[PDB]
Short mmCIF file of all heavy atoms in Angstrom, two decimals:
data_model
loop_
_atom_site.label_atom_id
_atom_site.label_comp_id
_atom_site.label_asym_id
_atom_site.label_seq_id
_atom_site.Cartn_x
_atom_site.Cartn_y
_atom_site.Cartn_z
N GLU A 362 124.31 36.01 85.35
CA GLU A 362 123.38 35.35 84.44
C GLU A 362 123.44 33.84 84.59
O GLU A 362 122.52 33.16 84.16
CB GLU A 362 123.59 35.82 82.99
CG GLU A 362 124.87 35.33 82.29
CD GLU A 362 126.16 36.11 82.61
OE1 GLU A 362 126.13 36.99 83.51
OE2 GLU A 362 127.21 35.80 81.98
N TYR A 363 124.48 33.28 85.22
CA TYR A 363 124.60 31.85 85.43
C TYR A 363 123.75 31.37 86.62
O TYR A 363 123.66 30.17 86.82
CB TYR A 363 126.02 31.39 85.72
CG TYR A 363 127.08 31.63 84.65
CD1 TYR A 363 128.42 31.40 84.91
CD2 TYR A 363 126.74 32.07 83.36
CE1 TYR A 363 129.40 31.62 83.96
CE2 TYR A 363 127.72 32.31 82.41
CZ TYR A 363 129.05 32.08 82.71
OH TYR A 363 130.03 32.31 81.79
N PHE A 364 123.16 32.29 87.39
CA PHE A 364 122.60 31.97 88.69
C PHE A 364 121.08 31.91 88.62
O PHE A 364 120.48 32.45 87.68
CB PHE A 364 123.02 33.02 89.72
CG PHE A 364 124.48 32.92 90.11
CD1 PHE A 364 125.49 33.29 89.23
CD2 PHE A 364 124.87 32.41 91.34
CE1 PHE A 364 126.82 33.18 89.58
CE2 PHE A 364 126.20 32.31 91.70
CZ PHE A 364 127.17 32.69 90.82
N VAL A 365 120.48 31.25 89.61
CA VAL A 365 119.04 31.27 89.75
C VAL A 365 118.62 32.68 90.18
O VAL A 365 119.26 33.31 91.01
CB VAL A 365 118.53 30.22 90.75
CG1 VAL A 365 117.02 30.35 90.96
CG2 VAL A 365 118.91 28.82 90.34
N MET A 366 117.52 33.16 89.58
CA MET A 366 116.94 34.45 89.89
C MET A 366 115.55 34.20 90.48
O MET A 366 114.78 33.39 89.95
CB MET A 366 116.85 35.31 88.62
CG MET A 366 116.36 36.72 88.85
SD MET A 366 116.52 37.77 87.38
CE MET A 366 114.74 37.64 87.18
N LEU A 390 123.54 28.26 91.49
CA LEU A 390 123.77 28.17 90.06
C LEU A 390 122.54 27.55 89.40
O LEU A 390 121.98 26.56 89.87
CB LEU A 390 125.00 27.32 89.77
CG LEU A 390 126.32 27.93 90.25
CD1 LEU A 390 127.42 26.88 90.19
CD2 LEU A 390 126.66 29.16 89.43
N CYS A 391 122.12 28.15 88.28
CA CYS A 391 121.00 27.60 87.55
C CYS A 391 121.51 26.41 86.73
O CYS A 391 122.43 26.57 85.93
CB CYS A 391 120.33 28.63 86.66
SG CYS A 391 118.95 27.89 85.73
N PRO A 392 120.94 25.21 86.93
CA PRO A 392 121.49 24.00 86.31
C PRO A 392 121.32 23.93 84.80
O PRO A 392 121.89 23.06 84.15
CB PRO A 392 120.70 22.86 87.02
CG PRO A 392 119.44 23.49 87.52
CD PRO A 392 119.78 24.95 87.79
N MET A 393 120.51 24.83 84.23
CA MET A 393 120.35 24.91 82.80
C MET A 393 121.23 25.99 82.18
O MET A 393 121.21 26.16 80.97
CB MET A 393 118.88 25.16 82.48
CG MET A 393 118.07 23.85 82.71
SD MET A 393 116.36 24.26 82.37
CE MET A 393 116.46 24.64 80.61
N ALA A 394 122.00 26.71 82.99
CA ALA A 394 122.87 27.73 82.42
C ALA A 394 124.20 27.07 82.08
O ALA A 394 124.84 26.46 82.95
CB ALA A 394 123.04 28.88 83.40
N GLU A 427 113.55 27.79 92.58
CA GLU A 427 112.89 28.05 91.31
C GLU A 427 113.52 29.26 90.66
O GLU A 427 113.89 30.20 91.36
CB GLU A 427 111.40 28.32 91.55
CG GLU A 427 110.70 27.07 92.07
CD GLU A 427 109.20 27.14 92.27
OE1 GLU A 427 108.63 28.24 92.23
OE2 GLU A 427 108.64 26.04 92.53
N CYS A 428 113.58 29.23 89.33
CA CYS A 428 114.29 30.24 88.58
C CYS A 428 113.34 31.04 87.70
O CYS A 428 112.58 30.46 86.92
CB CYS A 428 115.41 29.64 87.73
SG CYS A 428 116.43 30.93 86.96
N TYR A 429 113.41 32.37 87.84
CA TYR A 429 112.53 33.29 87.15
C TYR A 429 113.31 34.20 86.20
O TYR A 429 112.79 35.22 85.76
CB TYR A 429 111.81 34.18 88.17
CG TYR A 429 110.80 33.39 88.99
CD1 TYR A 429 111.20 32.66 90.08
CD2 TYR A 429 109.45 33.37 88.64
CE1 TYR A 429 110.29 31.94 90.84
CE2 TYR A 429 108.53 32.66 89.39
CZ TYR A 429 108.96 31.94 90.48
OH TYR A 429 108.05 31.25 91.21
N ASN A 430 114.56 33.87 85.89
CA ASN A 430 115.31 34.72 85.00
C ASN A 430 114.74 34.57 83.59
O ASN A 430 114.83 33.52 82.99
CB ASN A 430 116.79 34.36 85.00
CG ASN A 430 117.59 35.38 84.22
OD1 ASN A 430 117.08 35.96 83.27
ND2 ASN A 430 118.82 35.62 84.63
N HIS A 433 116.70 32.93 80.74
CA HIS A 433 116.91 31.50 80.78
C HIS A 433 115.78 30.79 80.02
O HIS A 433 115.92 29.61 79.73
CB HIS A 433 117.00 30.98 82.23
CG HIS A 433 118.21 31.46 82.96
ND1 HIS A 433 118.50 31.10 84.26
CD2 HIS A 433 119.18 32.34 82.58
CE1 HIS A 433 119.64 31.68 84.63
NE2 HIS A 433 120.05 32.45 83.63
N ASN A 434 114.65 31.47 79.78
CA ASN A 434 113.55 30.89 79.01
C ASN A 434 113.09 29.55 79.59
O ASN A 434 112.89 28.59 78.84
CB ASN A 434 113.94 30.71 77.54
CG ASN A 434 114.04 32.06 76.85
OD1 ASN A 434 113.04 32.78 76.78
ND2 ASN A 434 115.22 32.44 76.39
N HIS A 435 112.90 29.45 80.90
CA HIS A 435 112.48 28.19 81.49
C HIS A 435 111.05 27.83 81.09
O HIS A 435 110.19 28.68 80.96
CB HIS A 435 112.63 28.23 83.02
CG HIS A 435 114.04 28.31 83.50
ND1 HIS A 435 114.88 27.22 83.41
CD2 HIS A 435 114.74 29.31 84.10
CE1 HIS A 435 116.05 27.55 83.97
NE2 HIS A 435 115.99 28.83 84.40
N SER A 441 114.32 24.67 87.22
CA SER A 441 115.62 24.68 87.87
C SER A 441 115.66 23.57 88.91
O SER A 441 116.58 22.76 88.93
CB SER A 441 115.90 26.02 88.47
OG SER A 441 114.81 26.49 89.24
ZN1 LIG B 704 117.49 29.66 85.44
#
Side-chain angles (χ1 to χ4, degrees):
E362 71 279 7
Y363 299 172
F364 288 72
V365 175
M366 184 171 106
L390 294 168
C391 179
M393 285 178 65
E427 294 184 348
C428 187
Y429 291 82
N430 188 329
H433 293 181
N434 289 299
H435 293 288
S441 49

